[PDB]
């Protein structure tokens, strides 16, 4: 086509929008002409509310037409190197030109993709969030593939060249093989029943929410493993570079040894009776919802500990690095000395008769559902106090920066003078002979 | 005298400003010279962190030097019409020039003000938040005075010309007779024991948090009255233009008639046994913490009602305009039909056996501490549900956009499948035969 032949086709397309609607076709034709006149490489038509596109200017390398309401596309020029048409209503794509490198077609209604095996320059496909039931055979040199949130039931052969692969939230039931250069795999939210070998190049592996009984041998290179919400009976041996492990909501009976590189562990909601020796550099331990009789000696750098919902009868020495401690629902009769930098303590649902001396940086304290007869002095740093369901007849003087006081289901005869910036006061089910004066600041009051 | 004499004084003042250097003196001398060179009216030196100012350019009308660390000021030029030096550390002011019109010296440590009676052009003084024990005699033509947050124990004579007056948060115990043009008075947070006469021109009156037994006659012009936190036994007759009344936290035994112009009423925390007939155009009624046996018929436009902490045994017809209803802590055995546009219902602490059909726009529901045996169907609009302390054995299907579920202290045998974006689940003290699966989303969990 000559130059004025395009000008006609585009001015004709400009009228096929009915007079008075949301489409900025006049702005689009302005850009189409500017692009043709200057032989520009890029053409961006995004956020103009288009239902269709006219014949595209040839000799362009990049077409961005995302965030519109397109139903299909016109044939693509042969010079085209990248295509960005995400956030549209595309049910299918045209045939793709040979020089193509990027394909971004996520957030559409694509039911199929065109033939991909003959686009050797195509290195990135983001076709996530579509209605794809199946993938055609992939390009030779594909580096990045994202096809999450689709209805895939099986996978084609994956290239040697492949590095990043997201196939999560599909209907996969197995993975036959992975390429040797894959460094990052997300296969969450499928129905996968078994993995085959993992390549040594792998460093991030996320298989959350599948139906595994066991994992294959893990690469020594592997750094982060997420294997939550499966039916794991045990973990395989863990590599020496693994620093983050989440194996929660499985049926693990016992852990193998943990490497010294491990800094973050989560084995919540399993069948553990005991933990093995924790590594020195561990900073975050979650071991809730298990059957723990006791914890092993805690490492010097541990800063967050959640050992709730267990049957721990005795709590060992707490390291000074600890800042967040939760031991709700255990068999505790006493807590040990609380470390100075502690900020949040949750020791509810045990058999405590009293609390240790509270450290001076404690901002949140929940010691409800114990048999506590009186409260030790409260630090001024305290903002939230929950001591419902205990054996209290009186509360100590309340710190001035307290915002929430919950002390219902006790035997309180009176409440102390209330802080002037208290937000919440819950003292139902008590023996109050006199009700306190309520600050203007309290917005959520329950009493008597 | 001359131009280069100022240039010297300012370059001398520029050296020096230790601890070198929290002060932008070089930027300030730049503006001082630009101001002198161009004979400009304004000079702004705010947010430059100055500890002092040098000799000012004469022939300027406006000096803005707020948000600095000034301890005193240089003598002010005679041409000066306005002064803005708030947010500083001024302990005193210089003598003020005759042509002055605005004085903004709030947020300082001023212990006294200079002689004001001889500045006839001075029409606005904002000297609030200082350490003033006393005011000098005021200008003849003063229109606006703000001296809130000071240590005043008495007031000088107020001009005829005075319109707006804020004297709140001081140590006043009585009021020096008010001028006849005053349209707006705030005398909150003093120890005022008695008001004398209010001028007819008055339209806004705020005497919150004083020690009044009664109010003088109110002007017919009066539109908004705040008289909270006093010892009022009764209100005087209310004028026909009054649209906002807050008489909460007093000792009122009964209300007089309410004018039809009244749109917002608050008589919380009084000694009321009944309310009088509500006006048709009322939109907001707060009558909490009283001894109400029943409410009168509610007007068609009432949108917010808080009649909590009373002894109401029967609740009359609720108008469709109602959106926010709170009847916590009364003698209710049943609720009437809930209007369609209702969004928040709080009916906790009554004797309810069941709830009416919940309207479809209800987002927050608290029906705790009743004797409810089963819950009617919950609308999908519901985000927060509190039904603790009731006679429930099961919960209905939970709407999908529920974020908080509190159903502790019941007889629940099981909980329904939980919404996937639930934040809080509190179901302690129940009969759960099996515990539900906990979504990843729930961050605050309490259960048996």
mmCIF file with all atom_site columns, N, CA and C in Angstrom, chain A residues 152-212:
data_model
loop_
_atom_site.group_PDB
_atom_site.id
_atom_site.type_symbol
_atom_site.label_atom_id
_atom_site.label_alt_id
_atom_site.label_comp_id
_atom_site.label_asym_id
_atom_site.label_entity_id
_atom_site.label_seq_id
_atom_site.pdbx_PDB_ins_code
_atom_site.Cartn_x
_atom_site.Cartn_y
_atom_site.Cartn_z
_atom_site.occupancy
_atom_site.B_iso_or_equiv
_atom_site.pdbx_formal_charge
_atom_site.auth_seq_id
_atom_site.auth_comp_id
_atom_site.auth_asym_id
_atom_site.auth_atom_id
_atom_site.pdbx_PDB_model_num
ATOM 1   N N  . UNK A 1 152 ? -4.534 -25.728 31.524 1.00 0.00 ? 152 UNK A N  1
ATOM 2   C CA . UNK A 1 152 ? -3.641 -26.724 30.945 1.00 0.00 ? 152 UNK A CA 1
ATOM 3   C C  . UNK A 1 152 ? -3.761 -28.046 31.677 1.00 0.00 ? 152 UNK A C  1
ATOM 4   N N  . UNK A 1 153 ? -3.792 -29.139 30.917 1.00 0.00 ? 153 UNK A N  1
ATOM 5   C CA . UNK A 1 153 ? -3.782 -30.490 31.483 1.00 0.00 ? 153 UNK A CA 1
ATOM 6   C C  . UNK A 1 153 ? -2.476 -31.239 31.192 1.00 0.00 ? 153 UNK A C  1
ATOM 7   N N  . UNK A 1 154 ? -1.650 -30.710 30.292 1.00 0.00 ? 154 UNK A N  1
ATOM 8   C CA . UNK A 1 154 ? -0.360 -31.318 29.980 1.00 0.00 ? 154 UNK A CA 1
ATOM 9   C C  . UNK A 1 154 ? 0.587  -30.299 29.358 1.00 0.00 ? 154 UNK A C  1
ATOM 10  N N  . UNK A 1 155 ? 1.866  -30.652 29.301 1.00 0.00 ? 155 UNK A N  1
ATOM 11  C CA . UNK A 1 155 ? 2.906  -29.743 28.834 1.00 0.00 ? 155 UNK A CA 1
ATOM 12  C C  . UNK A 1 155 ? 3.653  -30.314 27.635 1.00 0.00 ? 155 UNK A C  1
ATOM 13  N N  . UNK A 1 156 ? 3.928  -29.473 26.627 1.00 0.00 ? 156 UNK A N  1
ATOM 14  C CA . UNK A 1 156 ? 4.827  -29.882 25.544 1.00 0.00 ? 156 UNK A CA 1
ATOM 15  C C  . UNK A 1 156 ? 6.270  -30.034 26.024 1.00 0.00 ? 156 UNK A C  1
ATOM 16  N N  . UNK A 1 157 ? 7.162  -30.427 25.120 1.00 0.00 ? 157 UNK A N  1
ATOM 17  C CA . UNK A 1 157 ? 8.582  -30.517 25.450 1.00 0.00 ? 157 UNK A CA 1
ATOM 18  C C  . UNK A 1 157 ? 9.123  -29.119 25.702 1.00 0.00 ? 157 UNK A C  1
ATOM 19  N N  . UNK A 1 158 ? 9.948  -28.977 26.732 1.00 0.00 ? 158 UNK A N  1
ATOM 20  C CA . UNK A 1 158 ? 10.510 -27.683 27.093 1.00 0.00 ? 158 UNK A CA 1
ATOM 21  C C  . UNK A 1 158 ? 11.927 -27.557 26.538 1.00 0.00 ? 158 UNK A C  1
ATOM 22  N N  . UNK A 1 159 ? 12.261 -26.396 25.954 1.00 0.00 ? 159 UNK A N  1
ATOM 23  C CA . UNK A 1 159 ? 13.604 -26.140 25.415 1.00 0.00 ? 159 UNK A CA 1
ATOM 24  C C  . UNK A 1 159 ? 14.748 -26.240 26.422 1.00 0.00 ? 159 UNK A C  1
ATOM 25  N N  . UNK A 1 160 ? 15.935 -26.582 25.929 1.00 0.00 ? 160 UNK A N  1
ATOM 26  C CA . UNK A 1 160 ? 17.187 -26.473 26.692 1.00 0.00 ? 160 UNK A CA 1
ATOM 27  C C  . UNK A 1 160 ? 17.371 -25.065 27.240 1.00 0.00 ? 160 UNK A C  1
ATOM 28  N N  . UNK A 1 161 ? 17.037 -24.086 26.401 1.00 0.00 ? 161 UNK A N  1
ATOM 29  C CA . UNK A 1 161 ? 17.244 -22.665 26.685 1.00 0.00 ? 161 UNK A CA 1
ATOM 30  C C  . UNK A 1 161 ? 16.424 -22.101 27.843 1.00 0.00 ? 161 UNK A C  1
ATOM 31  N N  . UNK A 1 162 ? 15.379 -22.822 28.253 1.00 0.00 ? 162 UNK A N  1
ATOM 32  C CA . UNK A 1 162 ? 14.429 -22.339 29.260 1.00 0.00 ? 162 UNK A CA 1
ATOM 33  C C  . UNK A 1 162 ? 15.058 -22.134 30.635 1.00 0.00 ? 162 UNK A C  1
ATOM 34  N N  . UNK A 1 163 ? 14.792 -20.967 31.218 1.00 0.00 ? 163 UNK A N  1
ATOM 35  C CA . UNK A 1 163 ? 15.345 -20.564 32.515 1.00 0.00 ? 163 UNK A CA 1
ATOM 36  C C  . UNK A 1 163 ? 14.250 -20.369 33.572 1.00 0.00 ? 163 UNK A C  1
ATOM 37  N N  . UNK A 1 164 ? 13.235 -19.573 33.229 1.00 0.00 ? 164 UNK A N  1
ATOM 38  C CA . UNK A 1 164 ? 12.124 -19.267 34.137 1.00 0.00 ? 164 UNK A CA 1
ATOM 39  C C  . UNK A 1 164 ? 10.833 -19.884 33.610 1.00 0.00 ? 164 UNK A C  1
ATOM 40  N N  . UNK A 1 165 ? 10.087 -20.544 34.493 1.00 0.00 ? 165 UNK A N  1
ATOM 41  C CA . UNK A 1 165 ? 8.872  -21.257 34.106 1.00 0.00 ? 165 UNK A CA 1
ATOM 42  C C  . UNK A 1 165 ? 7.797  -21.169 35.191 1.00 0.00 ? 165 UNK A C  1
ATOM 43  N N  . UNK A 1 166 ? 6.688  -20.510 34.867 1.00 0.00 ? 166 UNK A N  1
ATOM 44  C CA . UNK A 1 166 ? 5.547  -20.432 35.764 1.00 0.00 ? 166 UNK A CA 1
ATOM 45  C C  . UNK A 1 166 ? 4.363  -21.123 35.107 1.00 0.00 ? 166 UNK A C  1
ATOM 46  N N  . UNK A 1 167 ? 3.936  -22.227 35.714 1.00 0.00 ? 167 UNK A N  1
ATOM 47  C CA . UNK A 1 167 ? 2.815  -23.030 35.221 1.00 0.00 ? 167 UNK A CA 1
ATOM 48  C C  . UNK A 1 167 ? 1.775  -23.242 36.315 1.00 0.00 ? 167 UNK A C  1
ATOM 49  N N  . UNK A 1 168 ? 1.791  -22.371 37.321 1.00 0.00 ? 168 UNK A N  1
ATOM 50  C CA . UNK A 1 168 ? 0.939  -22.534 38.485 1.00 0.00 ? 168 UNK A CA 1
ATOM 51  C C  . UNK A 1 168 ? -0.517 -22.243 38.163 1.00 0.00 ? 168 UNK A C  1
ATOM 52  N N  . UNK A 1 169 ? -1.406 -22.786 38.982 1.00 0.00 ? 169 UNK A N  1
ATOM 53  C CA . UNK A 1 169 ? -2.835 -22.551 38.845 1.00 0.00 ? 169 UNK A CA 1
ATOM 54  C C  . UNK A 1 169 ? -3.327 -23.044 37.480 1.00 0.00 ? 169 UNK A C  1
ATOM 55  N N  . UNK A 1 170 ? -3.107 -24.331 37.237 1.00 0.00 ? 170 UNK A N  1
ATOM 56  C CA . UNK A 1 170 ? -3.565 -25.021 36.032 1.00 0.00 ? 170 UNK A CA 1
ATOM 57  C C  . UNK A 1 170 ? -4.194 -26.353 36.458 1.00 0.00 ? 170 UNK A C  1
ATOM 58  N N  . UNK A 1 171 ? -4.385 -27.292 35.534 1.00 0.00 ? 171 UNK A N  1
ATOM 59  C CA . UNK A 1 171 ? -4.921 -28.611 35.878 1.00 0.00 ? 171 UNK A CA 1
ATOM 60  C C  . UNK A 1 171 ? -3.886 -29.690 35.550 1.00 0.00 ? 171 UNK A C  1
ATOM 61  N N  . UNK A 1 172 ? -2.634 -29.441 35.928 1.00 0.00 ? 172 UNK A N  1
ATOM 62  C CA . UNK A 1 172 ? -1.562 -30.410 35.702 1.00 0.00 ? 172 UNK A CA 1
ATOM 63  C C  . UNK A 1 172 ? -1.611 -31.504 36.757 1.00 0.00 ? 172 UNK A C  1
ATOM 64  N N  . UNK A 1 173 ? -1.311 -32.734 36.343 1.00 0.00 ? 173 UNK A N  1
ATOM 65  C CA . UNK A 1 173 ? -1.261 -33.877 37.260 1.00 0.00 ? 173 UNK A CA 1
ATOM 66  C C  . UNK A 1 173 ? 0.115  -34.549 37.305 1.00 0.00 ? 173 UNK A C  1
ATOM 67  N N  . UNK A 1 174 ? 1.047  -34.078 36.482 1.00 0.00 ? 174 UNK A N  1
ATOM 68  C CA . UNK A 1 174 ? 2.403  -34.606 36.460 1.00 0.00 ? 174 UNK A CA 1
ATOM 69  C C  . UNK A 1 174 ? 3.300  -33.690 35.655 1.00 0.00 ? 174 UNK A C  1
ATOM 70  N N  . UNK A 1 175 ? 4.609  -33.902 35.788 1.00 0.00 ? 175 UNK A N  1
ATOM 71  C CA . UNK A 1 175 ? 5.671  -33.181 35.109 1.00 0.00 ? 175 UNK A CA 1
ATOM 72  C C  . UNK A 1 175 ? 6.637  -34.291 34.697 1.00 0.00 ? 175 UNK A C  1
ATOM 73  N N  . UNK A 1 176 ? 6.776  -34.481 33.387 1.00 0.00 ? 176 UNK A N  1
ATOM 74  C CA . UNK A 1 176 ? 7.566  -35.578 32.817 1.00 0.00 ? 176 UNK A CA 1
ATOM 75  C C  . UNK A 1 176 ? 9.049  -35.308 32.909 1.00 0.00 ? 176 UNK A C  1
ATOM 76  N N  . UNK A 1 177 ? 9.467  -34.131 32.450 1.00 0.00 ? 177 UNK A N  1
ATOM 77  C CA . UNK A 1 177 ? 10.845 -33.703 32.537 1.00 0.00 ? 177 UNK A CA 1
ATOM 78  C C  . UNK A 1 177 ? 10.953 -32.187 32.447 1.00 0.00 ? 177 UNK A C  1
ATOM 79  N N  . UNK A 1 178 ? 12.005 -31.707 33.094 1.00 0.00 ? 178 UNK A N  1
ATOM 80  C CA . UNK A 1 178 ? 12.437 -30.329 33.099 1.00 0.00 ? 178 UNK A CA 1
ATOM 81  C C  . UNK A 1 178 ? 13.782 -30.186 32.401 1.00 0.00 ? 178 UNK A C  1
ATOM 82  N N  . UNK A 1 179 ? 14.002 -29.051 31.721 1.00 0.00 ? 179 UNK A N  1
ATOM 83  C CA . UNK A 1 179 ? 15.297 -28.803 31.093 1.00 0.00 ? 179 UNK A CA 1
ATOM 84  C C  . UNK A 1 179 ? 16.408 -28.549 32.106 1.00 0.00 ? 179 UNK A C  1
ATOM 85  N N  . UNK A 1 180 ? 17.663 -28.744 31.689 1.00 0.00 ? 180 UNK A N  1
ATOM 86  C CA . UNK A 1 180 ? 18.820 -28.633 32.578 1.00 0.00 ? 180 UNK A CA 1
ATOM 87  C C  . UNK A 1 180 ? 19.241 -27.221 32.993 1.00 0.00 ? 180 UNK A C  1
ATOM 88  N N  . UNK A 1 181 ? 18.695 -26.177 32.381 1.00 0.00 ? 181 UNK A N  1
ATOM 89  C CA . UNK A 1 181 ? 19.083 -24.801 32.734 1.00 0.00 ? 181 UNK A CA 1
ATOM 90  C C  . UNK A 1 181 ? 18.061 -24.055 33.574 1.00 0.00 ? 181 UNK A C  1
ATOM 91  N N  . UNK A 1 182 ? 16.909 -24.682 33.799 1.00 0.00 ? 182 UNK A N  1
ATOM 92  C CA . UNK A 1 182 ? 15.822 -24.094 34.588 1.00 0.00 ? 182 UNK A CA 1
ATOM 93  C C  . UNK A 1 182 ? 16.340 -23.662 35.957 1.00 0.00 ? 182 UNK A C  1
ATOM 94  N N  . UNK A 1 183 ? 16.223 -22.375 36.274 1.00 0.00 ? 183 UNK A N  1
ATOM 95  C CA . UNK A 1 183 ? 16.673 -21.846 37.571 1.00 0.00 ? 183 UNK A CA 1
ATOM 96  C C  . UNK A 1 183 ? 15.516 -21.496 38.503 1.00 0.00 ? 183 UNK A C  1
ATOM 97  N N  . UNK A 1 184 ? 14.298 -21.460 37.978 1.00 0.00 ? 184 UNK A N  1
ATOM 98  C CA . UNK A 1 184 ? 13.165 -21.017 38.771 1.00 0.00 ? 184 UNK A CA 1
ATOM 99  C C  . UNK A 1 184 ? 11.866 -21.620 38.239 1.00 0.00 ? 184 UNK A C  1
ATOM 100 N N  . UNK A 1 185 ? 11.213 -22.430 39.074 1.00 0.00 ? 185 UNK A N  1
ATOM 101 C CA . UNK A 1 185 ? 9.978  -23.115 38.702 1.00 0.00 ? 185 UNK A CA 1
ATOM 102 C C  . UNK A 1 185 ? 8.885  -22.863 39.727 1.00 0.00 ? 185 UNK A C  1
ATOM 103 N N  . UNK A 1 186 ? 7.734  -22.416 39.238 1.00 0.00 ? 186 UNK A N  1
ATOM 104 C CA . UNK A 1 186 ? 6.532  -22.303 40.035 1.00 0.00 ? 186 UNK A CA 1
ATOM 105 C C  . UNK A 1 186 ? 5.482  -23.214 39.404 1.00 0.00 ? 186 UNK A C  1
ATOM 106 N N  . UNK A 1 187 ? 5.155  -24.310 40.090 1.00 0.00 ? 187 UNK A N  1
ATOM 107 C CA . UNK A 1 187 ? 4.069  -25.201 39.668 1.00 0.00 ? 187 UNK A CA 1
ATOM 108 C C  . UNK A 1 187 ? 3.024  -25.372 40.776 1.00 0.00 ? 187 UNK A C  1
ATOM 109 N N  . UNK A 1 188 ? 2.708  -24.274 41.465 1.00 0.00 ? 188 UNK A N  1
ATOM 110 C CA . UNK A 1 188 ? 1.701  -24.264 42.520 1.00 0.00 ? 188 UNK A CA 1
ATOM 111 C C  . UNK A 1 188 ? 0.290  -24.516 41.998 1.00 0.00 ? 188 UNK A C  1
ATOM 112 N N  . UNK A 1 189 ? -0.614 -24.835 42.913 1.00 0.00 ? 189 UNK A N  1
ATOM 113 C CA . UNK A 1 189 ? -2.049 -24.895 42.623 1.00 0.00 ? 189 UNK A CA 1
ATOM 114 C C  . UNK A 1 189 ? -2.422 -25.721 41.391 1.00 0.00 ? 189 UNK A C  1
ATOM 115 N N  . UNK A 1 190 ? -1.754 -26.854 41.225 1.00 0.00 ? 190 UNK A N  1
ATOM 116 C CA . UNK A 1 190 ? -2.131 -27.844 40.225 1.00 0.00 ? 190 UNK A CA 1
ATOM 117 C C  . UNK A 1 190 ? -2.646 -29.081 40.966 1.00 0.00 ? 190 UNK A C  1
ATOM 118 N N  . UNK A 1 191 ? -2.798 -30.201 40.265 1.00 0.00 ? 191 UNK A N  1
ATOM 119 C CA . UNK A 1 191 ? -3.050 -31.491 40.907 1.00 0.00 ? 191 UNK A CA 1
ATOM 120 C C  . UNK A 1 191 ? -1.893 -32.461 40.720 1.00 0.00 ? 191 UNK A C  1
ATOM 121 N N  . UNK A 1 192 ? -0.664 -31.938 40.771 1.00 0.00 ? 192 UNK A N  1
ATOM 122 C CA . UNK A 1 192 ? 0.536  -32.739 40.504 1.00 0.00 ? 192 UNK A CA 1
ATOM 123 C C  . UNK A 1 192 ? 0.664  -33.828 41.562 1.00 0.00 ? 192 UNK A C  1
ATOM 124 N N  . UNK A 1 193 ? 0.896  -35.059 41.116 1.00 0.00 ? 193 UNK A N  1
ATOM 125 C CA . UNK A 1 193 ? 1.001  -36.215 42.008 1.00 0.00 ? 193 UNK A CA 1
ATOM 126 C C  . UNK A 1 193 ? 2.431  -36.708 42.198 1.00 0.00 ? 193 UNK A C  1
ATOM 127 N N  . UNK A 1 194 ? 3.356  -36.226 41.372 1.00 0.00 ? 194 UNK A N  1
ATOM 128 C CA . UNK A 1 194 ? 4.729  -36.699 41.400 1.00 0.00 ? 194 UNK A CA 1
ATOM 129 C C  . UNK A 1 194 ? 5.612  -35.823 40.538 1.00 0.00 ? 194 UNK A C  1
ATOM 130 N N  . UNK A 1 195 ? 6.807  -35.547 41.032 1.00 0.00 ? 195 UNK A N  1
ATOM 131 C CA . UNK A 1 195 ? 7.802  -34.830 40.274 1.00 0.00 ? 195 UNK A CA 1
ATOM 132 C C  . UNK A 1 195 ? 8.807  -35.839 39.820 1.00 0.00 ? 195 UNK A C  1
ATOM 133 N N  . UNK A 1 196 ? 9.440  -35.547 38.700 1.00 0.00 ? 196 UNK A N  1
ATOM 134 C CA . UNK A 1 196 ? 10.538 -36.328 38.220 1.00 0.00 ? 196 UNK A CA 1
ATOM 135 C C  . UNK A 1 196 ? 11.752 -35.475 38.584 1.00 0.00 ? 196 UNK A C  1
ATOM 136 N N  . UNK A 1 197 ? 12.889 -35.815 38.012 1.00 0.00 ? 197 UNK A N  1
ATOM 137 C CA . UNK A 1 197 ? 14.141 -35.210 38.446 1.00 0.00 ? 197 UNK A CA 1
ATOM 138 C C  . UNK A 1 197 ? 14.127 -33.699 38.306 1.00 0.00 ? 197 UNK A C  1
ATOM 139 N N  . UNK A 1 198 ? 14.765 -33.033 39.260 1.00 0.00 ? 198 UNK A N  1
ATOM 140 C CA . UNK A 1 198 ? 14.957 -31.595 39.221 1.00 0.00 ? 198 UNK A CA 1
ATOM 141 C C  . UNK A 1 198 ? 16.359 -31.322 38.696 1.00 0.00 ? 198 UNK A C  1
ATOM 142 N N  . UNK A 1 199 ? 16.498 -30.367 37.770 1.00 0.00 ? 199 UNK A N  1
ATOM 143 C CA . UNK A 1 199 ? 17.817 -30.045 37.243 1.00 0.00 ? 199 UNK A CA 1
ATOM 144 C C  . UNK A 1 199 ? 18.688 -29.362 38.284 1.00 0.00 ? 199 UNK A C  1
ATOM 145 N N  . UNK A 1 200 ? 20.012 -29.559 38.210 1.00 0.00 ? 200 UNK A N  1
ATOM 146 C CA . UNK A 1 200 ? 20.931 -28.990 39.201 1.00 0.00 ? 200 UNK A CA 1
ATOM 147 C C  . UNK A 1 200 ? 20.915 -27.461 39.213 1.00 0.00 ? 200 UNK A C  1
ATOM 148 N N  . UNK A 1 201 ? 20.602 -26.866 38.064 1.00 0.00 ? 201 UNK A N  1
ATOM 149 C CA . UNK A 1 201 ? 20.522 -25.409 37.911 1.00 0.00 ? 201 UNK A CA 1
ATOM 150 C C  . UNK A 1 201 ? 19.417 -24.743 38.713 1.00 0.00 ? 201 UNK A C  1
ATOM 151 N N  . UNK A 1 202 ? 18.474 -25.537 39.215 1.00 0.00 ? 202 UNK A N  1
ATOM 152 C CA . UNK A 1 202 ? 17.303 -25.024 39.927 1.00 0.00 ? 202 UNK A CA 1
ATOM 153 C C  . UNK A 1 202 ? 17.674 -24.373 41.261 1.00 0.00 ? 202 UNK A C  1
ATOM 154 N N  . UNK A 1 203 ? 17.117 -23.185 41.508 1.00 0.00 ? 203 UNK A N  1
ATOM 155 C CA . UNK A 1 203 ? 17.403 -22.406 42.737 1.00 0.00 ? 203 UNK A CA 1
ATOM 156 C C  . UNK A 1 203 ? 16.137 -21.957 43.487 1.00 0.00 ? 203 UNK A C  1
ATOM 157 N N  . UNK A 1 204 ? 15.012 -21.845 42.779 1.00 0.00 ? 204 UNK A N  1
ATOM 158 C CA . UNK A 1 204 ? 13.728 -21.517 43.389 1.00 0.00 ? 204 UNK A CA 1
ATOM 159 C C  . UNK A 1 204 ? 12.720 -22.569 42.943 1.00 0.00 ? 204 UNK A C  1
ATOM 160 N N  . UNK A 1 205 ? 12.083 -23.234 43.900 1.00 0.00 ? 205 UNK A N  1
ATOM 161 C CA . UNK A 1 205 ? 11.100 -24.265 43.586 1.00 0.00 ? 205 UNK A CA 1
ATOM 162 C C  . UNK A 1 205 ? 9.862  -24.078 44.445 1.00 0.00 ? 205 UNK A C  1
ATOM 163 N N  . UNK A 1 206 ? 8.724  -23.894 43.786 1.00 0.00 ? 206 UNK A N  1
ATOM 164 C CA . UNK A 1 206 ? 7.463  -23.691 44.467 1.00 0.00 ? 206 UNK A CA 1
ATOM 165 C C  . UNK A 1 206 ? 6.443  -24.675 43.928 1.00 0.00 ? 206 UNK A C  1
ATOM 166 N N  . UNK A 1 207 ? 6.073  -25.628 44.771 1.00 0.00 ? 207 UNK A N  1
ATOM 167 C CA . UNK A 1 207 ? 5.119  -26.665 44.398 1.00 0.00 ? 207 UNK A CA 1
ATOM 168 C C  . UNK A 1 207 ? 3.973  -26.704 45.448 1.00 0.00 ? 207 UNK A C  1
ATOM 169 N N  . UNK A 1 208 ? 3.762  -25.573 46.127 1.00 0.00 ? 208 UNK A N  1
ATOM 170 C CA . UNK A 1 208 ? 2.618  -25.368 47.033 1.00 0.00 ? 208 UNK A CA 1
ATOM 171 C C  . UNK A 1 208 ? 1.312  -25.892 46.437 1.00 0.00 ? 208 UNK A C  1
ATOM 172 N N  . UNK A 1 209 ? 0.508  -26.562 47.255 1.00 0.00 ? 209 UNK A N  1
ATOM 173 C CA . UNK A 1 209 ? -0.878 -26.881 46.898 1.00 0.00 ? 209 UNK A CA 1
ATOM 174 C C  . UNK A 1 209 ? -0.969 -27.821 45.689 1.00 0.00 ? 209 UNK A C  1
ATOM 175 N N  . UNK A 1 210 ? -0.347 -28.984 45.834 1.00 0.00 ? 210 UNK A N  1
ATOM 176 C CA . UNK A 1 210 ? -0.444 -30.073 44.868 1.00 0.00 ? 210 UNK A CA 1
ATOM 177 C C  . UNK A 1 210 ? -0.789 -31.346 45.633 1.00 0.00 ? 210 UNK A C  1
ATOM 178 N N  . UNK A 1 211 ? -0.497 -32.525 45.088 1.00 0.00 ? 211 UNK A N  1
ATOM 179 C CA . UNK A 1 211 ? -0.813 -33.774 45.778 1.00 0.00 ? 211 UNK A CA 1
ATOM 180 C C  . UNK A 1 211 ? 0.377  -34.729 45.836 1.00 0.00 ? 211 UNK A C  1
ATOM 181 N N  . UNK A 1 212 ? 1.512  -34.218 46.300 1.00 0.00 ? 212 UNK A N  1
ATOM 182 C CA . UNK A 1 212 ? 2.732  -35.007 46.399 1.00 0.00 ? 212 UNK A CA 1
ATOM 183 C C  . UNK A 1 212 ? 2.763  -35.874 47.649 1.00 0.00 ? 212 UNK A C  1
#
